[PDB]
Design a protein around this ligand. Structure first.
Ligand code: HEC
Ligand code: HEC
Ligand code: HEC
Ligand code: HEC
Ligand code: HEC
Ligand code: HEC
Ligand code: SF4
Ligand code: SF4
Ligand code: F3S
Ligand SMILES: [Mg+2]
Lengths: 164, 951, 164, 55, 342
């Protein structure tokens, strides 16, 4: 909430790998240290961040959105085919501490893999969560499904799509 | 209770520079079998090596690699890799080692260096060869003394006899019509195996447009990987290949010697001498290292006769730096330590306590040396004997270089910082040079910068190869008299053991590799153990077995009774037989090999190790301490007596002959040339009485018109039994290694298996047929209709979708798949505990829990990744098409086949290689009568035999 | 509930490892190593110095798609604590007091493009050997590929030309 | 565990500077010494048209 | 008969759960609402098996409970301990043996027999069909559902023999279970044994008549293979030893009848071995040929399921009566009424 809605950094600054790989990059210590070697270092809320970047041990973040590890989510194909964050993560830009917005089911994943027109957006995947889905979501969704090459649900509900 | 545990997740402190996290990176390196390095692409998953592919720019890797390169991953992540410097078995540091090494150095610099000695393997590393040359410069009385047990002494002694100069021979097999292999194993792993296999099989792959197909003759004692692929294979004793080669020289017209033979052998020899002298310049005569130096000398003389030199046989500068006779250098070294002269002995690899011939009694003269040195890579049998054992860095974590079979000299790259300490041979040789704490990066930079330049070193790091350096072509004169003035030794005393490299263990360095011990041995399918190899006639004459080996003789009029008698000839396998060699007794179980030469025994070097890790701690029975340094490859005195005490010899197949079914379809090149579809027409006329079958089916299937339908193509003319495709699909897909117990039960976990089938008349000189069997990816799959939780289903792309997380384990899906390619995790086979084995798992594939099914998925991590890549690049351009390239997906067991028999791609697109292969008339699906409609189809093995041995 | 392959034995992208010393399965780059078919044979593409000084040129010619790639890579990384206009005055510059430099001063307009590329790569400043010092922008070599850093330099020049 | 109510932030945000500079990028205009704000996607077209130096 | 059907069902029904190796996910074969949105395949024969054993278990339990309600009403009325009268009372539901209750009794029992009669034929046809839909040469046989139905009646009549000759002798129920009872039960076992021997002939005819190599090698490997001992013991057990039952004195001889029933059960087990294991040993590809040897744990589980069967049978013969008290009183009425009208 303080960094994205207030300070205002785009999510590809810290999650730099969100449109290239399956894994959206979890931010390293150096990403914090471009700002926090000057923007109030010697602060108690950053002693772990300053303990890293001096000793090599990682700051041991806790995974909020967690899949069971044979599901093989790909981030790049979701952001590239017109699905932005806040369809899958909610308004993270307003989150002081991040919660999981919904349970990552086969129901939810197969719901978008069977009706991709309800959640697809005209690119601007990495735009801040000021985006609102319009009223003509069926119309603009069908045009963006046919425009991005979103495949029929007989192909996207295949098991070797996700599980491998 | 919560659905999962918390799952802490660790980012970096400083990010790696050039990589996006979650994307594998490919690095070029070099991996050496017997010093001769093959260029590899090693996948870097998150900065660690995970999968070894072939570097496509390298010689001896024209896309593919052999199996030892493919199992270098599990060699690297062995938990028993040596972790620390050990002084006397007690751990020490590098500083203590270097202080003692400086003390030993100043002890021998007062003299010129009469006590300091080395022992390496064959070093094709110009950095390391340079460093040992400066060490011999600083110590003029010090000597090198290189040795490996699977050496190349007879090719270089044949060069010495033939030309008076150490030369190498590089065979261009793409311009060959009649390849003749007098006990040669160029289709087995070794020097230039992948390039020779690629050239041979590119001349083997026959289409309708193909008007030329080559002809292989192999004359061998042990059946081998080269023995299968030949159109004519003569089982002749390894003592008699010298006489056979002399008779070939007699009939071809050069100075040789007359010889006497069995009439099958003599008719075979005149057939060779008629196929040779018909293809002058278009023939190759190849000898293998096992054979004596006069065999290589006479092979040089024959290849000069037929115009083969300079067109299909190329003599080159010696790529092995300084070449010697390594067994002569060994008996020189053992006599030196027997005299007490040797003071400082330095060993870089090699396992010389274990790998030596046992007549030298190497370990007893090892303790005569006060201060020994071992750079070992495993706490081994020699590092137990020697003092100051040093951890050797694995090639995947080392900086260095290695010359190929043509002297390419590619640069070994570290994909990770060295795991357990890690000190390379360049750093060890720099430590004995005098200066300490020199890294292998700076050493090979300082050798290779200023030799090819920095800007050339950058390209030599990016591409695998070095552009400028190569072995230059030389044409030495051939002494037709000095070859003639040689005995050409005559065969025959009695039973003769041939000593063979193990096809999966090589010299025994890979004995701790879990994948390679589990991997079935070519032509025997024995796993986890060593065996003496007999002919059925040989064991009937030697072991006192109450059988005939003459009811095996006959035609197709009594074929099934012969096959049943060969099945009755089994269950005598595993009989322990006491032999007596020259002072040595091995007491090894026997395994029957129908292709074997009579009165010949194949003992496989590589087993019987004592100080390997948890894998292969006592696996096999040791062949080395009976082996004699005078004739390291064969000897003619053996006393095979029975013992009783039958041992469990474990095989993957169990049944040897195809029992009169349409599994492996064989043809001839003349009738295939006149009619390509005649192979099926002769099958289907006997089965149904119609030339074309009409397989009506009730089930519709799916149509697969406008889709990318993935299919596999396997050419039986090109596959040899290399078994690198099994290790590749093991490494890529995290298939667990089960022990000897579970293969004894019959629960090996292999997604692709090689079917060896021994089918032919007389059944003691048979035709051997290797067939890869992965899943056929059956369009109308019997294996999906039965599995009740809908866990194996078909997709849009037509490939069988085995879902490990849905399997409950009914194993019905096993019983209904007619090819039995599915595999069940009966116990917890996957290594759940050992962290080094957890590092070797490729994270793009699920590591399977107990109780779920397993089969090859058309290597669907690569299909899914190329699909996501095509769709991302299509939406980045905006085409809305998603067109995927033909070369976009190369499966691992396709990417690692050296012969290129496995071909994969889209079959709906007619431009693809696999669809052009499936349009051929000799394409056939396995078991067509079950209406499965396989996507993995086979090309029938079209042979090119000669007019003299078949017609 | 059964948790069979939910947390598999294999190591994921940023799965923690007890075997490695720092606590990271993902290992740092080995020094002096390059991937397949990626070379540093041209020094101007991967560092700003050919003869050791500033160049005021580029390796590749400027296209509008390269310029827009530089725009996007600027607006992710660079425009926080420099402003979308490039004047320095952003909101990271208000809380903390970094005092970033505006682009459109004459000192940077006279400055070459290779000066910019060296600034993206290596940040700027270092603690002086006497009397101490600090580092200011910390360098963005790990996050931006060097071709994209040259694209950022091209859109810097577009920004200076836009405001002059 | 109902959906959290994330506390509505106050103070200045990045949006004021961001849309001020987004106005400053297009839509022409003047400054202290610069002759005219040539807009981005017009100044972008001009800077490719007169080109950057190559090598 | 109903009691050992229920106990053999409890012994059998553990095996689909037990043979999985992920047995905690047995409910995935059941169509249940999940967050995944997946379904059982429903064209698999194990998917038919789950419905089949569950319906068969529930219907045989229902038939046992309605068959037990009036005998519960008698046992409540004679219990002589006060707390046991409530226990058999709520078991009987206060049955109140009466017309307009007996009408619905005979009506529902005849009609449930009419429901369960095609049902057990189909449930053992579906136990056949988990081989009979499979493409294995010894398993794809069209005769399999009536032949498995006959083999099931044959082995079950063997078991009812082996477990009711002691119930007739040790518990003094000689008047209720006469010698003509055992005569007619041997006759019905003889009928099903001939249909099973006919099924073996049909297998031999399928293997000889067909020109396929695979059916012929099936017959060879059953006759002269490594596991051919079970097929020879099958034709000794289930075929040679059944021809004694044609003669009345062999049927009326109690030790001979018991021992021949024991050979029926053992050879029936051998028939299942010959059908399943031998056909899975040797298949289309000879590289995929391997011998099957059971461990100590297969025999351990078999003996343990015998223990579960005999334990449940012994609690049954303790707390509940083993002969229908009613419908024997009705049979007494029908016998004396036949003795009246002649
Ligand atoms: C995105 C990668 C960029 C680019 C292209 C530039 N910056 Fe920075 N910048 C920051 C600060 C505190 C200053 C003043 C002093 C300094 O860094 O030492 C600057 C100044 C510049 C310059 C002038 C050259 C110099 O002395 O450094 C240039 C060419 C420049 N910037 C380009 C701070 C930041 C950031 C705060 C965390 C961010 C992000 C960037 N800069 C990003 C970029
Ligand atoms: C600048 C682009 C930032 C980076 C990247 C990160 N932080 Fe920061 N953070 C920044 C500012 C300008 C502010 C508000 C002003 C202030 O300093 O209070 C914040 C706020 C925080 C704070 C509070 C104090 C602070 O020193 O900045 C914390 C503890 C914080 N953000 C956490 C944090 C972490 C862990 C970061 C690495 C991923 C991180 N921030 C990056 C500036 C920037
Ligand atoms: C809607 C908001 C979706 C969510 C939830 C999930 N996916 Fe998806 N994903 C979506 C589309 C429209 C596409 C590409 C369409 C196409 O042309 O294929 C994807 C892409 C994938 C892919 C690529 C596979 C393929 O395209 O063949 C996979 C494997 C994938 N996404 C994985 C995945 C998983 C595991 C999901 C649950 C967390 C998931 N996606 C959700 C749209 C949406
Ligand atoms: C991505 C869109 C998927 C598709 C296609 C399929 N599976 Fe999946 N699966 C996925 C998710 C995100 C979930 C949720 C994890 C959870 O349990 O909530 C699942 C769940 C399953 C499960 C349960 C896993 C377990 O309990 O061990 C199974 C067994 C399962 N799905 C089966 C399955 C099958 C057979 C599929 C092909 C038709 C299939 N899934 C597709 C992701 C996706
Ligand atoms: C739709 C589905 C989305 C999209 C639109 C976004 N994220 Fe990602 N996200 C998603 C899942 C299933 C997960 C966890 C990964 C898993 O296997 O469970 C995540 C998680 C992240 C992460 C964690 C690391 C990881 O993905 O492996 C990061 C970091 C992250 N999300 C960032 C991110 C950003 C910046 C997004 C906007 C472009 C974004 N995600 C979109 C599912 C989805
Ligand atoms: C410093 C700048 C910063 C940027 C900007 C930022 N994040 Fe993050 N993000 C982090 C850090 C650190 C983590 C890991 C800590 C955590 O899990 O909260 C993280 C992780 C997350 C996680 C947790 C995922 C998981 O399972 O751990 C979510 C959700 C997330 N980012 C969403 C976003 C989105 C969407 C954006 C783009 C608007 C964004 N973040 C922008 C720093 C940032
Ligand atoms: S399967 Fe591939 S690697 Fe193995 S022998 Fe055949 S071609 Fe060679
Ligand atoms: S045998 Fe092969 S093709 Fe047939 S169902 Fe099994 S995996 Fe599919
Ligand atoms: S039948 Fe199905 S239940 Fe599993 S073992 Fe096979 S995928
Ligand atoms: Mg988890």
């Amino acid at each position: 909430q303080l960094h994205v809605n207030v300070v205002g950094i785009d999510c590809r600054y810290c999650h730099t790998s969100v449109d290239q790989s399956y894994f959206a990059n979890i931010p390293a210590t150096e990403t914090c240290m471009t700002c926090h070697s000057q923007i109030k270092t010697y602060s108690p809320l950053l002693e772990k961040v300053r303990e890293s970047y001096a000793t090599g041990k990682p700051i041991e973040w806790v995974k909020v959105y967690d899949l069971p590890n044979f599901v093989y989510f790909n981030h790049s194909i979701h952001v590239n085919k017109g699905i932005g964050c806040s369809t899958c993560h909610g308004q993270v830009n307003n989150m002081p501490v991040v919660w999981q917005q919904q349970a990552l089911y086969m129901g939810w994943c197969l719901n978008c893999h069977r009706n991709p027109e309800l959640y697809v957006r005209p690119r601007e995947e990495v735009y801040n969560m000021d985006y609102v889905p319009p009223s003509n979501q069926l119309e603009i969704g069908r045009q963006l499904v046919a425009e991005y090459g979103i495949m029929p649900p007989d192909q996207l509900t295949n098991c070797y799509v996700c599980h491998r | 209770c919560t659905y999962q545990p918390r799952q802490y997740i660790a980012p970096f402190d400083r990010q790696p520079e050039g990589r996006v996290p979650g994307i594998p990176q490919y690095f070029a390196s070099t991996l050496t079998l017997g010093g001769y390095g093959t260029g590899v692409l090693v996948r870097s998953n998150e900065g660690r090596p995970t999968k070894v592919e072939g570097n496509p720019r390298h010689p001896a890797s024209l896309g593919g690699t052999d199996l030892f390169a493919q199992a270098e991953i599990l060699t690297m992540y062995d938990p028993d890799r040596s972790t620390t410097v050990l002084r006397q078995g007690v751990p020490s540091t590098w500083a203590e080692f270097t202080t003692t090494l400086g003390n030993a150095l100043t002890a021998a610099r007062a003299t010129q260096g009469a006590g300091v000695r080395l022992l390496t393997t064959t070093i094709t590393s110009p950095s390391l060869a340079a460093q040992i040359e400066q060490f011999l410069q600083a110590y003029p009385q010090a000597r090198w003394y290189q040795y490996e047990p699977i050496n190349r002494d007879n090719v270089v002694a044949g060069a010495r006899l033939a030309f008076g100069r150490d030369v190498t021979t590089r065979y261009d097999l793409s311009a060959a019509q009649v390849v003749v292999s007098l006990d040669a194993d160029f289709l087995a792993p070794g020097p230039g195996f992948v390039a020779y296999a690629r050239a041979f099989a590119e001349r083997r792959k026959v289409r309708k447009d193909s008007t030329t197909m080559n002809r292989l003759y192999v004359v061998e004692a042990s059946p081998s990987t080269t023995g299968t692929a030949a159109d004519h294979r003569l089982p002749l004793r390894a003592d008699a290949i010298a006489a056979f080669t002399g008779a070939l020289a007699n009939e071809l017209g050069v100075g040789g010697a007359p010889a006497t033979l069995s009439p099958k052998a003599e008719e075979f020899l005149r057939a060779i001498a008629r196929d040779l002298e018909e293809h002058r310049g278009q023939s190759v005569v190849i000898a293998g290292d096992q054979q004596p130096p006069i065999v290589h000398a006479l092979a040089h003389l024959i290849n000069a006769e037929l115009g083969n030199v300079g067109q299909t046989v190329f003599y080159h500068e010696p790529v092995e730096a300084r070449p010697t006779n390594q067994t002569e250098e060994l008996v020189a070294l053992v006599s030196e330590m027997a005299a007490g002269r040797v003071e400082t002995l330095i060993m870089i690899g090699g396992n010389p306590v274990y790998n030596a011939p046992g007549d030298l009694r190497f370990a007893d003269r090892m303790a005569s040396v006060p201060l020994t040195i071992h750079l070992s890579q495993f706490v081994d049998e020699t590092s137990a004997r020697a003092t100051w054992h040093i951890p050797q860095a694995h090639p995947l974590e080392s900086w260095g270089d290695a010359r190929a079979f043509d002297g390419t000299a590619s640069i070994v790259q570290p994909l990770i910082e060295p795991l357990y300490g890690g000190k390379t041979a360049n750093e060890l040789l720099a430590a004995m040079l005098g200066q300490p704490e020199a890294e292998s990066y700076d050493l090979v930079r300082s050798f290779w910068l200023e030799q090819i330049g920095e800007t050339g070193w950058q390209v030599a790091l990016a591409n695998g190869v070095i552009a400028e350096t190569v072995a230059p072509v030389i044409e030495p004169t051939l002494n037709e008299g000095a070859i003639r003035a040689t005995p050409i030794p005559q065969p025959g005393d009695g039973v003769e053991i041939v000593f063979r490299p193990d096809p999966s263990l090589f010299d025994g360095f890979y004995a701790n590799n879990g994948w390679l011990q589990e991997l079935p041995r070519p032509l025997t399918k024995l796993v986890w153990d060593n065996a003496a190899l007999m002919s059925p006639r040989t064991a009937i004459k030697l072991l006192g077995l109450p059988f005939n080996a003459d009811r095996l003789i006959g035609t197709e009029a009594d074929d099934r009774e012969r096959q049943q008698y060969l099945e009755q000839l089994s269950k005598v396998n595993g009989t322990i037989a006491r032999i007596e060699y020259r002072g040595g007794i091995i007491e090894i179980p026997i395994w029957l090999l129908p292709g074997h030469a009579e009165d010949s025994i194949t003992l496989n070097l590589g087993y019987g190790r004592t100080h390997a890790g948890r894998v292969g701690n006592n696996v096999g029975i040791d062949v080395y301490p009976i082996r004699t340094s005078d004739s390291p490859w064969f000897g003619a005195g053996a006393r095979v007596t029975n013992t009783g005490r039958t041992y469990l010899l474990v095989s993957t197949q169990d049944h040897w002959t195809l029992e009169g079914r349409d599994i492996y379809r064989v043809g001839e090149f003349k009738k295939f040339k006149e009619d390509p579809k005649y192979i099926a027409k002769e099958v289907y006329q006997e089965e149904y009485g119609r030339e074309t079958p009409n397989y009506q089916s009730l089930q519709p299937g799916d149509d697969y018109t406008g889709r990318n339908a993935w299919g596999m193509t396997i050419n039986l003319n090109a596959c040899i039994g290399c078994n690198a495709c099994v290790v590749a699909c093991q490494a890529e897909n995290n298939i667990a290694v089960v022990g000897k117990d579970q293969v004894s039960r019959g629960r090996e976990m292999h997604w692709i298996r090689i079917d060896r089938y021994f089918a032919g008349e007389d059944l003691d000189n048979p035709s051997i047929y290797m067939m890869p069997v992965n899943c056929m990816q059956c369009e109308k799959a019997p294996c999906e209709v039965v599995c009740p939780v809908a866990a194996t289903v078909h997709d849009y792309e037509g490939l069988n979708n085995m879902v490990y997380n849905r399997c409950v384990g009914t194993k019905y899906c096993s019983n209904n798949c007619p090819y039995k390619v599915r595999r069940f995790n009966f116990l917890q086979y996957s290594d759940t505990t050992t962290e080094t084995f957890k590092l070797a798992f490729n994270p793009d594939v699920t590591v399977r829990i107990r109780g779920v099914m397993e089969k090859c998925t058309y290597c669907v991590q690569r299909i899914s990744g190329a699909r996501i890549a095509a769709k991302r690049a299509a939406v980045q351009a905006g085409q809305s098409s998603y067109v995927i390239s033909d070369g976009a997906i190369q499966t691992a067991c396709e990417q690692a086949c050296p012969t290129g028999a496995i071909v994969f791609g889209d079959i709906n697109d007619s431009n693809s290689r696999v669809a052009k292969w499936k349009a051929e008339g000799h394409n056939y699906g396995l078991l067509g009568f079950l209406n499965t409609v396989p996507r993995t189809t086979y090309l029938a093995r079209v042979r090119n035999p000669s007019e003299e041995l078949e017609k | 509930c059964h948790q069979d392959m939910y947390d598999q034995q294999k190591y994921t992208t940023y799965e923690p490892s007890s075997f490695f010393a720092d606590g990271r399965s993902s290992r740092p780059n080995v020094p002096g190593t390059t991937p397949f078919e990626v070379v540093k044979t041209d020094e101007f593409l991967y560092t700003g110095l050919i003869d050791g000084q500033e160049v005021d040129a580029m390796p590749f010619p400027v296209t509008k798609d390269l310029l827009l790639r530089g725009q996007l890579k600027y607006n992710i990384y660079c425009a926080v604590c420099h402003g979308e206009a490039g004047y320095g005055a952003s909101m990271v510059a208000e809380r903390g007091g970094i005092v970033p430099a505006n682009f459109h001063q004459q000192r940077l307009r006279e400055a070459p493009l290779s000066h910019f590329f060296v600034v993206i790569t290596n940040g700027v400043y270092r603690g002086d050997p006497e009397n101490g010092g600090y580092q200011s922008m910390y360098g963005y070599a790990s996050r931006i590929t060097p071709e994209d850093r040259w694209a950022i330099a091209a859109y810097i020049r577009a920004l200076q030309l836009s405001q002059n | 565990p109902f959906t959290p109510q994330p506390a509505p932030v106050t103070g200045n945000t990045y949006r004021t500077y961001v849309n001020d500079a987004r106005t400053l990028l297009n839509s022409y205009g003047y400054t202290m010494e610069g002759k005219v704000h040539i807009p981005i996607d017009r100044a972008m077209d001009l800077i490719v048209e007169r080109g950057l130096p190559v090598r | 008969a109903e009691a050992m059907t229920l106990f053999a069902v409890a012994c059998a029904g553990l095996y689909p759960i037990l043979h999985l190796g992920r047995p905690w996910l047995f409910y995935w074969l059941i169509p249940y609402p999940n967050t995944h949105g997946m379904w059982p395949q429903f064209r698999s024969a194990l998917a038919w098996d789950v419905f089949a054993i569950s319906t068969y278990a529930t219907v045989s339990l229902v038939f046992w409970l309605v068959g037990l309600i009036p005998d519960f009403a008698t046992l409540r009325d004679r219990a002589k301990n006060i707390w046991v009268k409530r226990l058999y009372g709520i078991a009987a539901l206060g049955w109140r043996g009466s017309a307009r209750h007996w009408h619905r009794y005979e009506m529902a029992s005849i009609l449930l027999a009419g429901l369960s009669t095609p049902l057990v034929v189909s449930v053992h046809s579906i136990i056949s069909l988990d081989f009979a839909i499979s493409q294995v040469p010894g398993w794809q046989v069209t005769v399999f559902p009536p032949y498995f139905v006959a083999g099931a009646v044959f082995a079950g009549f063997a078991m009812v023999l082996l477990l009711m000759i002691p119930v007739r002798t040790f518990y003094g129920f000689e008047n209720y279970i006469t010698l003509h009872h055992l005569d007619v039960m041997a006759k019905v076992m003889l009928t099903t044994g001939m249909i099973v021997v006919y099924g073996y002939f049909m297998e031999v005819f399928a293997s000889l008549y067909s020109g396929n190599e695979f059916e012929e090698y099936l017959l060879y490997n059953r006759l002269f293979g490594p596991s051919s001992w079970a097929y020879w013991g099958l034709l000794f057990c289930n075929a040679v030893a059944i021809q004694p039952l044609w003669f009345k004195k062999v049927r009326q001889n109690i030790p001979a009848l018991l021992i021949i029933s024991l050979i029926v059960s053992v050879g029936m087990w051998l028939e299942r071995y010959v059908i399943i294991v031998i056909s899975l040993e040797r298949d289309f590809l000879p590289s995929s040929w391997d011998i099957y040897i059971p461990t100590i744990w297969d025999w351990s589980l078999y003996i343990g399921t015998f223990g579960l069967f005999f334990t449940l049978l012994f609690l049954f013969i303790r707390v509940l009566p083993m002969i229908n008290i009613f419908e024997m009183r009705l049979f007494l009425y029908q016998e004396t009424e036949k003795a009246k009208q002649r």
